[PDB]
Each structure stands twice: as structure tokens, then as C-alpha cells.
């Protein structure tokens, strides 16, 4: 999925628009967890029937969300044969102490992170992909920028440590194996891809996060609330592909409505 | 009641639906205390007439609630010959210092607990069953999860203690006999069953708490507020039974309707 | 009055219901102070005309209330020839430092207390009867329970003191003569009767307070706000008499209507 | 005015009811400073025209109010030939540091006090009469009780001091001459009369304050807001006169409406 | 302007009433800042056209207001040939650190002050007149009284200082030259006139402030909100003139109407 | 641009008014950010179509805004061939740690500053012009005044330092090269022009900021919300040109209508 865009969709017809626009994958969900999160409601796993109806409408991979720590929601979604599971902070947490033991599943997981310690704990638990936490539903890109900047800074700062005993102290505070931290410092990057997510609203935002070093982008239900969803979706895809070309970015950004 | 579901019911017709869906017992209550706790009202024992009309309508066991410390409410319910009494934090407490002396009744009691100390105090007073406190009426499973995790953890932490003097110190703080704590540490579990309660909303939630080591499940009035109550009740019963079979859990979770 | 129920009444016809239901006395009042507390109003002694009209309607004793420290309100009520005076915290206090010199009157007084020191000060001032304070008008029994439990706990705690000098120090702090405290510690009880009051809502509540050691029960205007006042009044009287009979308590508690 | 009742009145016809009921004096005022004090308004001296119209309607003495420290309001009221001036905390203060120099006037002044130090400062400034501050407009007698109890207690406590140097220390803290304090301690009372005021609502209240040692009572506009003002006014007068007679107090308190 | 009254006016017809009543000057303003200060609006210099239309309507001197620190607003008003400028705290401040350099203008300025230090800083900057700040729009005279009392008191307290080094210390804290402070202490007064302002509502209020040692009086838009504006304005003028004649003060205060 | 006025415009017809009134440049924007700040909305770069439509309407320079740190918004606006970019705090910031690397662009940038350290960091990053921050949309000039006064005060304070090591310590704290701070202390000014911005509401406000040492003036959408926009725009241009002429400032400030 490297270099691609993943789009949130709430109906089979929305999924078809995403596919036609050039999305790499879709995220199936029954409710927008930003509308009812401001209603006070509890947000859970979506009904397996609505997820299956979306799986049957497109040929590209389909992802679905589960609550933090809800390993039974994950068992059910795995049995449904989805392509990826997102253990998501946007839904209402089920366990405020323990995340899912992701290394007991065959299906790959994506998790959010806002700093280096969080990213490594999620990977140690078994995550196959990392993304920014951002701030979902607001359309403010600054959160996602903060998280990618912070991870990059913390890797460079640990690389300046000359004492192996000092490195071991850092790993202990992070609650991860010293061998995982040492691997990051040798490569100068996380062992898995890191995608942008939360508050990506415009084609310019998508290109900004790619220039900052992200491997792809997630976009939310904001796409389908615009005056012309097809045009906006297509523009975000083009901007992610051609992220280093100012003339193309100008072209796709003009007269968006 | 090991491995079963107990359902809150407010009418005789609701009790019949619970029985048909495969519930192991029903809890009789005249009003939902969660709906009242938002108005300032005092919530007490239900009228014995409404409890009896429910007892007359089903052949499965029937439970009823009393206020914390209200031993006369409990004497009345025992005389009515209900099957179990819940000394409940959801009702308005009658005594803020002392709980009921439960070992002086014939009928068994269930009590709530959030940690190991609280569980052991309720058992020492005479409780026959323990349950999580959770957060009643919210539909959020996370409080029930917190409580089962905490009890399990505090047992393991006390098992690491090498000094018998330190163990006696712990029991003193808990205000329980040292012999009760020692039995728990040797067995690795409470001496009575521990059920999930408060915030169980979906079949997946019921199976989650059974996988965490609960012995059964209490569910609330949310069942009867859904678009299809009999379908939801049956699905919760099936998930509590088949709690570690993923193909069955997918089957019962599909096309559930609006919760 | 011992073993009996005293009922608040606002009209002659309410007094007649109380008498027929088996009350031992009535308390005459022109306004429900709990209704007037919500209005921010000052609550005082009732008009002597309305009290006299109640006195003429029944052949059981009649009590009336006065503000804390208002010795002139008490002089007027004594001249009217009422049977007892309640120096009451439910009315708006008149003197925040000094209570009435009750030993200068011929008519007996009842006073409220929340702990042992308070009870002994009221007795030293001249009170003939003590009652719990509770929380008047809320229908929550927990405050009356707290007060009776406290007094009992403080007596037991003082009974553990070995030094007479230490006992003398406690009496000085309480502002009462040492001879009064000594009598209480020898006999394990107050020298006058102690009734339950404030927040007694159901027959079960009345029997609970009698089992905790109270000598009788005061009930408020909640009786006459229920669906069937005569039925509820009679049930509270029966529960106070038969407080240690679970089968009888079940009988009178069933099908009571809305409370 | 010893043993008498002074009544607040807002019209000439109200003044006539007060006189017929047996009042010793009336207090003339255009507005009730409890209604508009809860409206946020500034309360001042009343119009000299309305005061004169009341003076012309009755034969008994008439009093009027001025703001704390407003010595020009007092000059105007003195020129009008009223019988007494009340420098009153119920009106909006004009000077939050200095009270009126009352010893520069011919007309006598009444002032409020809540403790011994306050009472002596008001007398030192020139007051001819003291009254309780109470709490006006509320009908709660407890304030007035507090103030009479406090003055009595503080006199008795100073009388227990055996050192004349200790007495001088007390006077210095009170900001009054040592010879004024020493006079009080010798007599066991203030050198001027002390009346009850603020929150006197019923005949029982009036008798209570007289039994506590007050020399007379002030009553407010509550009288004229009752169902039967003539009956209530007459009952308060009888209760003040016969303050130590329970049978008479019962008689006047029955069927008041 | 010694011994006179200055009146706030919002139209040419209001200015004519002020002149006929005996005012010594008028203050031209397009809106009452007290009515706006409750809405959050920015209050600035008035439109020069409205100020000129007032100047054209009367033969007495005319004043106008500028924001604190706004020296260009002052340059515009000076070019218009108004008679006096008020650098006013009632308008929205333009500079929160620095006031206008008033000694660089030809037209005289008036400034507000709450204590001796503040008065001396305004004089050092070049003010020709001082006034109390009071509390504008409230009708409460007590703030104006506080300010005149404080200045008078702080002068007397500084006069008790026996050390010239201590005097220099005081001037340093005030941020003024020692020669300015010393002149005040020797004379027992400020080197310029000091007028009452903010909260003057009645004729008695005007005479009160003159008896306290003020040199004249500013009055606000309250004059024109009364039932009879010409009667009230005339009475305030007469009381400011005859400020220590009680028979005259009684005469002008009688039958004033609703304020 | 030096000595001139830059005006915010939301349509081609507004741009034409600005040009005819004598503006030196226009700032193109699709929404008034002050109106959108009240709505809680995110404010971003404007649509390139609306900017181009304004570019086609006038023959004076056109500027456009981007979010703080949003270097891709800046890349797009540069490709459009606008004349200047404003990296603006009035839009919703994109990067709360890092501003744009402005020296990597061909198009010049303007940035805001509230003190000397901030001004020098923006210049070191590559800014061609500095402006005050002020308080955008409120019409209160005091914040722009505060910022210009601060920068001047801090230059004078640093000029008093005798030690080169002390100067080096100040530069380290500011996070700028010592050579940049040294140049400012020698010449008594910034190396680039500094314009007034934020809260400039009247002609008098514009002239005030020019007299305080600003090089030119930015004005906001308040111009086009007044009764007569062309009249107000022309008056602000004339006041900026003739800032030290009191008779001219009186002329253009009179009879302006509602603001
Ligand atoms: O990834 C680096 C960005 O492109 C620019 O950020 P910077 O201000 O740290 O140079
Ligand atoms: O009972 C243990 C659970 O099934 C797994 O939880 P955990 O691995 O996060 O501790
Ligand atoms: O007065 C004793 C009560 O009946 C029971 O109280 P307890 O629970 O503390 O034993
Ligand atoms: O003035 C004394 C009162 O009549 C009674 O008050 P007391 O409680 O202090 O005795
Ligand atoms: O200027 C002094 C006043 O006229 C009187 O005030 P005072 O005696 O309270 O200090
Ligand atoms: O920049 C100097 C200003 O024009 C006047 O300021 P100032 O009042 O501090 O002298």
C-alpha cells in the first residue's frame, strides 16, 4: 500500500467512488465516530453484514476497526476475512491498560502513535503498520505534523547517545526490548511503514505529509461531505502520487469547490 | 448458575421473553435506577407485589435488589422466598459504614467489587457470589474489564510476597482474616464464583468477559430497548455459552439491528 | 409514647386519619418546612389558631415546633397548653449560639442530635426526649441511620477509657458535667428515650430504625402525599409495633401504591 | 422613645395607620431599600417634599435616612427640621472610610452596630442612639439576636480584665478614648439607648428582643405587605409594651393572618 | 472654569440647554461610552463634524475626548480649535504604557487620577487640570469621594517625613522629579486645579465634593435621562455655586422628580 | 511598497476600489478569517481560482496568505506567480514548532513579530518584510502599538550592554547568529522594512503608527463593512502619505460615516 491513499466509506456506492478515483484500499465503517463522539455515544465494531456488503462491491482490499483491547471483536473480524484490522483510538476503548496481543492473529494490524515510545510498544505487541494519531474529524493537519516531527526528532536524539548502557536505560523506560530500539537506531527509521492520518483535508495537506517522510495517507469522511466528492477524491490521489511536483499540485488544487 | 446469563426484567411479559431466550435467571425490578439516578430520586427495594407477579410467570430462578446496609428490606425479600438477593450499589445506600450481615440469612447474596480488598470484605460478611461493579446504564464495557483485570493482578502481586508477616500486614489493611487471604493465594482465585456486570451491551462483550475468566454474565434493560429484543437476548445467551468459538461468534453477531 | 409513631399533620382532617391509623401523637404545623426551604423563606412557629383547631379534633397528645433559641415562641406555645414542644432545626434558627433554657418550663421538650456530645448538651439544657436529625423531606433514611450508629460507637469508644482524668477531659470538650457522661458510660445508654426522625419513608425504614435501638418513630408530610395515606399510615404503625416479625412486615409492605 | 416602636412608612396614609396603632415615631422613606437593592440601584436620601408631606400628616416625631458619610445630605435634612437622622447602612454608602461628624449638628443621630468596638466608635463620633444592624428585608430575626448577644458578651469579658494597662490596649485597638471604654465597664452598659432593628417580623420577635435587653424596636415595610396591616401593627405595639406577659403575647399572636 | 459645572452633551440642542442652565463649559461626545462598555465595542475620538456642529451652537467653551496615548487624535482635535482636551480612561486605551506628551501641545489637557502618584505623573507629562476618576455611569458618588480623600491624605502623610532622603525615595517610586513633590509638600496642594468627576448624580453630591475641596464639577448624560433635564441642570449649577449654604441647598433639592 | 497601504479584498470588484483609492498592493482572500475564528473553523490557503481572478482585475501587486509551516501551500502559491506570500498567524497554524524555510523560494515573504527575538528569527529564516501582529478583526489599535514600542525598547536596552560576551548570550537565547544582532545594535533598526498591521481602523490610527516609525500600513476587511468604503479607503491612503500634517488629517477624518 506504499504511496497510496486509504479512504473511509459508509456505503457500497461510496466504496465504488473510492475505487474509481484510484484509492489503494477502503476502510469500512457504519457510523462516523466523530459525529456521535460529540453525541456522547459508545462507538464499537461495525455490523459484519455492512462490512461484507462493502467487500462484495469492490476488488481492492478492505479494512475494518475494533476497540482498543477488544480481542473478541478482532476474532470476529478475522473470521470474516477482512484484509487488515485497525485497533483504533477513535472508537471507545475497551481496556484502558492492555492493547490486543496482535501476534496471536494471522490478519495484519495497523495502530496509531504520537511518539517513539508509543510506536515501539505497538510494534512489540505485533502491529504490522503504524499511523499518526492526528485529530480526527476536525480537518486540522497540525496534529499529524506534530507526530511525524516528534518521531523523527526522537530517533535522531537517541542516535547521538554514545553509551550502550544509556541506550538500555531508554528502552527500559519505553517498556520495550533493547534489541528493538537498537535496530531503529541502526536503520534510522521504524521497521514498519508509517502512514499519515487524522486531519488530512486538502490535496496540499496530503503532499505536505509525504514530503515530511510518510509512506502513504489515510483520509476520512470529509471527502464525501464536500460539494464534489469524485473530484476531491481524485485530486487527493494525484497529490499523493505526485507529491514533489508544484505545477501538478497547482493544477489539481484549482477550482475544487 | 455457572456459565449462564441473568437478565433484568420490569414486567411478567419481559420475564417470559428472557426464559424463552435461554436465560438462567431473571432479576426483578420495578424501575431502572440508571434512568432515575439522573433525576435525584431515592431508589429503594421494589414492591413485593410486582416481584411476586414475576415469580408467578416463569419457572427459572428469580433475583431482587436491596439497598446497601438495609437488612430489613432483605428480611422481607427472604420471607417472600426469592431465590437470590443483590445488595446493590445502583440503589440509594441505606448505611454508608456497614453492609448487611449476610451470613445470618438462609438465602444466598450477590455483591459488587472493584478490587481484591473489596471482594474479600464482601465474602467475609457472607456473600455467596461476587460480580464486577462496571458502569450500569452506559453500555461501555471498559469498567467491567478494569475490575476483573485488577482482581486478577492483585492476586498475582500478593503471590510474590515472600514474608508471611507482610501477608498479615496486607490482610490487616484489607480488614479481613489472614486465613481468608492465604486461601486465595494458594488457590490463585476467589473461593466463590465471579460474574461480569455493568456495561455488557453486545454478544462480543459477553464472550470477552468469559475469556477474561468470569463465571457468567448479568445484562441490563438495554436488551429490551433494541429493535428486536428476542433476537438480541438469544444471541447474548449463545455467545456466553460458545465463548471461545470464533465461527459461532461471527454467526450470532451478524445482522443484529439497532442497539 | 414509647414504641409508637408521631405523625406531622397540617389540617384537622389529617389529624383524624393519624388517630384512626393508630398514631401515638400528632405534630401540628401550618406549612411543610421542606417546601418552604426550596422557596428561600423564613419558617417560624405556626399560628396558635391552627394549632388549637387541631387540638380540638383528636384525643391523643399534640406537639408543636419552635425555632432554635426562640424562648418567647416557647412561652406562647406553653400558654396554649400543648403537650410537647419540639425545638427544631427544620425551622429557621433564631439564636446561632444559645438553645432554649428548657428546665425553666413545665411542658416537656424534644431536641435533635447527630452525635454523643450534642445529645448530652441538649439533655443538660433540660430536654425530656432526644431524636435523630436525619435529612427532613428527602425520603433518604441514611442520615438517621448515621446518627444512631454514631451515638452507639462513641459510647463504646469512651467505655474503653481507663483513666478518670481522661473521662473528665472528654466531658470538658463536650461542655457538660462529668457526672452526666459517667452515668452514660456505666449504663451503656442515654438517660432519656431516643426516637428515629428525618427521612423515614417506608414501613421497612421504620422497622430498620427500631432494630438499631430506637425507642419510637417520627414521620413527616410524605404520608399525606402518597396514593393511599390511610393505608400507608396504618402500615407504618404496624411495622413499628411488629418490628422483628418478617412475615408481618412482608404483609404490610405489599401493594402500597406510589410513594 | 424608650419602650416604643418606630415604623417605616412610604405615604401619609401609612403614617396615619402607624400613629393610630400606637407607634412612638415614624421613619419616612420614598423607596424600600430592600426591593431596589436587589435591583442593583443606588439608594439615596428621599425627596424633601415627600418627607414634609409625612411630617404634616401626624403629630408624633418623624425620622429620615442619609447615606454613610454624606454630611451634605444631613445638612439638608437638618434644615428641613426632622426630629432624628438615621445614618444608615441600608442606603448606598457615600464614604467607605469616614462616617459623618455628628457632633457638628443640633439634630440627634441613630447609627447601627454589630459589636462593642463599632458601637463605641459611633458614639465617639456623636451618635445619640444605637441600634442593631440585623439583616433588613429578610424577616430573619437571628442577625439582631447575634448583635445584642455579642455586645453583652464583650462588655462582660472586658469587665474581667484586672490590669488598667490591658484596658488601654483594648481601647487603642477599638480606636476610641480609654475614658469612654472605662465608663462602659463601670456601668455595665452603653451610655446611650440600644434599639432592636433588622428582621423583626412578628409580635413574638419584638418581645424576644426586649427580653434580651433592648430599649425599643424598629420595624420595616413588612408590616404594610401583610393581609391586615392595622391588626399586625397594633399587635407589635402591644407585644413591645407587655413583653414579659405570656398570656397577653398568646392573645395578640392568635389569628394574625 | 473655577467654581463651575461642565456638562456632557450629545447633540446641539442638548448644548443649548446646558448653556441656558448656567454651565461653564460643555463636553462634546457622539455616544456614551458607559452604554458601550457593556457591549465590548471600541470607543474612540468622536467625528470632528459632530464636534463642530456643537461648537457652532453655543458661545461657552467646548471640550472633547481622546484615547489614552493617542497623540494623533489629539493633533486633529487641536487643529479643530476645541478649547480643552480630555485624555480619558472611559475610551478604549491606545497605548497601555505611555500617555500623551501633553507639554508639546498649545491646547490645555485634563487627566484623571486616583492617588497622589498618578496625579503627579499626569502633571509632569503636562496636564493643566486634574479630575477624579470616580466610576462613570453608575450614579454612585463613593468612588469620587475615595479619590479626593486619598490625594489629601497622601499629601499629609508625606508632610510628616523628616528626612529629605526619604522624600527623594518617594519621588523615585512615583517616577517624578523630586522638585515637583517638594513644591506640593510646601504648598499643601497640587499646582493645578482638581475637579470632581464620575458618579455625581444629585445637587447634594455636587456640594459634597466642593466641601471636600474640589475646584469644580463634571456631570454626565444622567442629566438628560431625568424627567425634567433643565430643572436638574439648573439645580446642580446652583448647588455648585452656593456649596456651603444649607437653606439654598434645601431649596434646590426639593421636588426634583425622577432621576 | 514603502510609504503605502496594502488592503484585504475578497472579490475582483473590491480589488478595483482599492486600486482607484490609491493602494500600493492588495491581499487576496476568500474568507475573512476573523469571521471564521468565531465559527471554530479551520482557515487555510484560498482557492487558486479566486486569487487568479483578482490578479486579472488590477495592475498593482497581489499578495496571498499561507498557514504557518505549510511549505506545500507556499510551493503552490509560488507556482501561481503571486507577488508576495504572507506566512500568517491569522490562519490556522500547520506546524507549531517550525516555520517555512523561506530562503528556498524565489518569491518574497512577509512575517509577523511581537518582539525583537521574534523579528530576528523570521529574518534569519528568510523573510523580506516584517509587520506587527496586532489583534486582527477587533479594530483596537493598542496591540500594534505595543509591538512597535516593544521592538524599539529592546533595541535600546541591548545597546546599553558593554560586553561582547553578554551580546553573544542574548543572541544564543534568541536562537539567531550573533552577527545579525550586532548589525541591529550598531544601526538602531531592523535590516528590513517593518509595517503596521492588525487593528488599524481609522485614518488617525494609520498616521499614529507612521509617527511611531512604521514603514507602511496593512488594513483589513473593516474597510468594506463601513457605510462608504471608497471614502474610507481614500482617507486611509491620504493619512498614510500625509502622516505629519494635522490640517490634512482633520480634513480626511471629518464626516466619515459609521465604522
Ligand atoms: O523534512 C524536512 C522538511 O522538509 C523541512 O523542515 P525543516 O524546517 O526542519 O528544514
Ligand atoms: O486472560 C488474559 C487475556 O486473555 C489476555 O490478556 P493480556 O495478554 O493482555 O494480559
Ligand atoms: O445494632 C446492630 C445492628 O442490628 C447490626 O449492625 P452490624 O451490621 O454492625 O452488626
Ligand atoms: O438574657 C438572657 C436570656 O434571657 C437567656 O439567655 P441564656 O441562655 O444565656 O441564659
Ligand atoms: O475636608 C474634611 C471634611 O469636611 C470632614 O471630613 P472628616 O472630619 O471625616 O475628616
Ligand atoms: O516614538 C516616539 C513617539 O512619537 C512618542 O513616544 P513617547 O511618548 O514615549 O515620547
PDB file of C-alpha atoms in Angstrom, chain B residues 19-154:
ATOM      1  CA  UNK B  19     -36.931 -17.556  29.779  1.00  0.00           C
ATOM      2  CA  UNK B  20     -37.647 -18.421  26.112  1.00  0.00           C
ATOM      3  CA  UNK B  21     -34.264 -16.972  25.010  1.00  0.00           C
ATOM      4  CA  UNK B  22     -32.382 -19.331  27.387  1.00  0.00           C
ATOM      5  CA  UNK B  23     -31.616 -17.092  30.404  1.00  0.00           C
ATOM      6  CA  UNK B  24     -30.513 -18.968  33.561  1.00  0.00           C
ATOM      7  CA  UNK B  25     -32.339 -16.498  35.888  1.00  0.00           C
ATOM      8  CA  UNK B  26     -34.150 -13.115  35.917  1.00  0.00           C
ATOM      9  CA  UNK B  27     -33.656 -10.008  38.114  1.00  0.00           C
ATOM     10  CA  UNK B  28     -36.997  -8.371  39.025  1.00  0.00           C
ATOM     11  CA  UNK B  29     -37.088  -4.541  39.279  1.00  0.00           C
ATOM     12  CA  UNK B  30     -39.954  -2.024  39.094  1.00  0.00           C
ATOM     13  CA  UNK B  31     -37.836   0.761  37.624  1.00  0.00           C
ATOM     14  CA  UNK B  32     -34.413   1.247  36.041  1.00  0.00           C
ATOM     15  CA  UNK B  33     -32.224   3.034  38.642  1.00  0.00           C
ATOM     16  CA  UNK B  34     -29.976   4.416  35.861  1.00  0.00           C
ATOM     17  CA  UNK B  35     -32.925   6.433  34.464  1.00  0.00           C
ATOM     18  CA  UNK B  36     -33.673   7.752  37.967  1.00  0.00           C
ATOM     19  CA  UNK B  37     -30.101   8.424  39.096  1.00  0.00           C
ATOM     20  CA  UNK B  38     -30.252  11.339  36.691  1.00  0.00           C
ATOM     21  CA  UNK B  39     -33.240  12.919  38.426  1.00  0.00           C
ATOM     22  CA  UNK B  40     -32.160  12.857  42.096  1.00  0.00           C
ATOM     23  CA  UNK B  41     -34.800  10.316  43.183  1.00  0.00           C
ATOM     24  CA  UNK B  42     -34.326   7.820  46.031  1.00  0.00           C
ATOM     25  CA  UNK B  43     -34.190   4.250  44.638  1.00  0.00           C
ATOM     26  CA  UNK B  44     -35.382   1.504  47.063  1.00  0.00           C
ATOM     27  CA  UNK B  45     -36.430  -2.215  47.194  1.00  0.00           C
ATOM     28  CA  UNK B  46     -39.264  -2.890  44.658  1.00  0.00           C
ATOM     29  CA  UNK B  47     -42.896  -3.529  45.764  1.00  0.00           C
ATOM     30  CA  UNK B  48     -43.196  -7.223  46.790  1.00  0.00           C
ATOM     31  CA  UNK B  49     -46.409  -7.474  44.686  1.00  0.00           C
ATOM     32  CA  UNK B  50     -44.550  -6.726  41.438  1.00  0.00           C
ATOM     33  CA  UNK B  51     -41.788  -9.213  42.382  1.00  0.00           C
ATOM     34  CA  UNK B  52     -44.399 -11.949  43.087  1.00  0.00           C
ATOM     35  CA  UNK B  53     -46.209 -11.349  39.761  1.00  0.00           C
ATOM     36  CA  UNK B  54     -42.853 -12.052  38.038  1.00  0.00           C
ATOM     37  CA  UNK B  55     -42.190 -15.179  40.199  1.00  0.00           C
ATOM     38  CA  UNK B  56     -45.640 -16.466  39.102  1.00  0.00           C
ATOM     39  CA  UNK B  57     -44.805 -16.103  35.363  1.00  0.00           C
ATOM     40  CA  UNK B  58     -41.607 -18.220  34.947  1.00  0.00           C
ATOM     41  CA  UNK B  59     -40.069 -21.488  36.206  1.00  0.00           C
ATOM     42  CA  UNK B  60     -36.430 -20.248  36.275  1.00  0.00           C
ATOM     43  CA  UNK B  61     -34.943 -18.652  39.479  1.00  0.00           C
ATOM     44  CA  UNK B  62     -35.783 -15.015  40.359  1.00  0.00           C
ATOM     45  CA  UNK B  63     -33.483 -12.394  41.988  1.00  0.00           C
ATOM     46  CA  UNK B  64     -34.297  -8.991  43.603  1.00  0.00           C
ATOM     47  CA  UNK B  65     -32.285  -5.956  44.833  1.00  0.00           C
ATOM     48  CA  UNK B  66     -31.971  -4.250  48.271  1.00  0.00           C
ATOM     49  CA  UNK B  67     -30.160  -1.017  49.384  1.00  0.00           C
ATOM     50  CA  UNK B  68     -26.621  -1.334  50.874  1.00  0.00           C
ATOM     51  CA  UNK B  69     -26.971  -1.978  54.628  1.00  0.00           C
ATOM     52  CA  UNK B  70     -30.793  -2.343  54.606  1.00  0.00           C
ATOM     53  CA  UNK B  71     -31.147  -5.649  56.486  1.00  0.00           C
ATOM     54  CA  UNK B  72     -34.949  -5.257  56.943  1.00  0.00           C
ATOM     55  CA  UNK B  73     -35.511  -4.919  53.171  1.00  0.00           C
ATOM     56  CA  UNK B  74     -33.552  -8.236  52.989  1.00  0.00           C
ATOM     57  CA  UNK B  75     -35.707  -9.886  55.731  1.00  0.00           C
ATOM     58  CA  UNK B  76     -38.864  -9.013  53.714  1.00  0.00           C
ATOM     59  CA  UNK B  77     -37.456 -10.417  50.437  1.00  0.00           C
ATOM     60  CA  UNK B  78     -36.305 -13.628  52.184  1.00  0.00           C
ATOM     61  CA  UNK B  79     -39.834 -14.128  53.617  1.00  0.00           C
ATOM     62  CA  UNK B  80     -41.170 -13.765  50.042  1.00  0.00           C
ATOM     63  CA  UNK B  81     -38.947 -16.752  49.058  1.00  0.00           C
ATOM     64  CA  UNK B  82     -36.993 -15.137  46.216  1.00  0.00           C
ATOM     65  CA  UNK B  83     -34.038 -17.291  45.081  1.00  0.00           C
ATOM     66  CA  UNK B  84     -31.148 -14.736  45.438  1.00  0.00           C
ATOM     67  CA  UNK B  85     -30.633 -11.198  46.880  1.00  0.00           C
ATOM     68  CA  UNK B  86     -28.439  -8.492  45.226  1.00  0.00           C
ATOM     69  CA  UNK B  87     -27.090  -5.962  47.797  1.00  0.00           C
ATOM     70  CA  UNK B  88     -26.721  -3.269  45.150  1.00  0.00           C
ATOM     71  CA  UNK B  89     -24.689  -0.050  44.745  1.00  0.00           C
ATOM     72  CA  UNK B  90     -27.150   1.026  41.988  1.00  0.00           C
ATOM     73  CA  UNK B  91     -29.860   1.672  44.620  1.00  0.00           C
ATOM     74  CA  UNK B  92     -29.523   4.554  47.151  1.00  0.00           C
ATOM     75  CA  UNK B  93     -27.323   3.341  50.095  1.00  0.00           C
ATOM     76  CA  UNK B  94     -29.104   2.989  53.488  1.00  0.00           C
ATOM     77  CA  UNK B  95     -25.905   2.666  55.598  1.00  0.00           C
ATOM     78  CA  UNK B  96     -22.663   4.338  54.469  1.00  0.00           C
ATOM     79  CA  UNK B  97     -20.479   2.487  57.016  1.00  0.00           C
ATOM     80  CA  UNK B  98     -21.826  -1.085  57.376  1.00  0.00           C
ATOM     81  CA  UNK B  99     -23.029  -3.646  54.780  1.00  0.00           C
ATOM     82  CA  UNK B 100     -25.612  -6.375  55.647  1.00  0.00           C
ATOM     83  CA  UNK B 101     -24.527  -9.312  57.889  1.00  0.00           C
ATOM     84  CA  UNK B 102     -25.236 -11.807  55.100  1.00  0.00           C
ATOM     85  CA  UNK B 103     -24.110 -14.948  56.979  1.00  0.00           C
ATOM     86  CA  UNK B 104     -27.251 -14.594  59.156  1.00  0.00           C
ATOM     87  CA  UNK B 105     -29.672 -15.261  56.282  1.00  0.00           C
ATOM     88  CA  UNK B 106     -30.534 -18.554  54.568  1.00  0.00           C
ATOM     89  CA  UNK B 107     -30.964 -17.102  51.062  1.00  0.00           C
ATOM     90  CA  UNK B 108     -27.685 -16.521  49.082  1.00  0.00           C
ATOM     91  CA  UNK B 109     -26.436 -12.939  48.342  1.00  0.00           C
ATOM     92  CA  UNK B 110     -24.512 -11.419  45.392  1.00  0.00           C
ATOM     93  CA  UNK B 111     -22.293  -8.308  45.962  1.00  0.00           C
ATOM     94  CA  UNK B 112     -20.225  -5.997  43.697  1.00  0.00           C
ATOM     95  CA  UNK B 113     -16.430  -5.468  43.887  1.00  0.00           C
ATOM     96  CA  UNK B 114     -13.818  -3.270  42.094  1.00  0.00           C
ATOM     97  CA  UNK B 115     -10.616  -4.769  43.663  1.00  0.00           C
ATOM     98  CA  UNK B 116      -9.319  -7.690  45.783  1.00  0.00           C
ATOM     99  CA  UNK B 117      -9.806  -5.967  49.179  1.00  0.00           C
ATOM    100  CA  UNK B 118     -13.441  -5.121  48.414  1.00  0.00           C
ATOM    101  CA  UNK B 119     -14.155  -8.683  47.178  1.00  0.00           C
ATOM    102  CA  UNK B 120     -12.700 -10.243  50.332  1.00  0.00           C
ATOM    103  CA  UNK B 121     -14.675  -7.926  52.667  1.00  0.00           C
ATOM    104  CA  UNK B 122     -17.959  -8.899  50.934  1.00  0.00           C
ATOM    105  CA  UNK B 123     -17.047 -12.639  51.144  1.00  0.00           C
ATOM    106  CA  UNK B 124     -16.098 -12.282  54.866  1.00  0.00           C
ATOM    107  CA  UNK B 125     -19.534 -10.693  55.537  1.00  0.00           C
ATOM    108  CA  UNK B 126     -21.142 -13.760  53.899  1.00  0.00           C
ATOM    109  CA  UNK B 127     -21.631 -13.149  50.129  1.00  0.00           C
ATOM    110  CA  UNK B 128     -22.155 -16.322  48.034  1.00  0.00           C
ATOM    111  CA  UNK B 129     -21.404 -14.630  44.673  1.00  0.00           C
ATOM    112  CA  UNK B 130     -19.231 -11.693  43.528  1.00  0.00           C
ATOM    113  CA  UNK B 131     -19.744  -9.525  40.396  1.00  0.00           C
ATOM    114  CA  UNK B 132     -17.973  -6.549  38.785  1.00  0.00           C
ATOM    115  CA  UNK B 133     -19.395  -3.099  39.515  1.00  0.00           C
ATOM    116  CA  UNK B 134     -18.769  -1.846  35.956  1.00  0.00           C
ATOM    117  CA  UNK B 135     -20.787   1.227  34.993  1.00  0.00           C
ATOM    118  CA  UNK B 136     -24.528   0.483  34.817  1.00  0.00           C
ATOM    119  CA  UNK B 137     -26.653   2.000  32.023  1.00  0.00           C
ATOM    120  CA  UNK B 138     -23.762   3.358  29.937  1.00  0.00           C
ATOM    121  CA  UNK B 139     -23.219   0.429  27.543  1.00  0.00           C
ATOM    122  CA  UNK B 140     -19.437   0.872  27.992  1.00  0.00           C
ATOM    123  CA  UNK B 141     -17.705  -2.483  28.737  1.00  0.00           C
ATOM    124  CA  UNK B 142     -14.400  -0.872  29.911  1.00  0.00           C
ATOM    125  CA  UNK B 143     -15.289  -0.564  33.622  1.00  0.00           C
ATOM    126  CA  UNK B 144     -16.164  -4.285  33.922  1.00  0.00           C
ATOM    127  CA  UNK B 145     -12.862  -5.115  32.162  1.00  0.00           C
ATOM    128  CA  UNK B 146     -10.932  -2.855  34.614  1.00  0.00           C
ATOM    129  CA  UNK B 147     -12.415  -4.666  37.644  1.00  0.00           C
ATOM    130  CA  UNK B 148     -11.693  -8.253  36.528  1.00  0.00           C
ATOM    131  CA  UNK B 149      -8.139  -7.228  35.445  1.00  0.00           C
ATOM    132  CA  UNK B 150      -7.456  -5.547  38.828  1.00  0.00           C
ATOM    133  CA  UNK B 151      -8.582  -8.522  40.977  1.00  0.00           C
ATOM    134  CA  UNK B 152      -6.511 -10.942  38.856  1.00  0.00           C
ATOM    135  CA  UNK B 153      -3.463  -8.647  39.090  1.00  0.00           C
ATOM    136  CA  UNK B 154      -3.655  -8.015  42.847  1.00  0.00           C
TER     137      UNK B 154
END
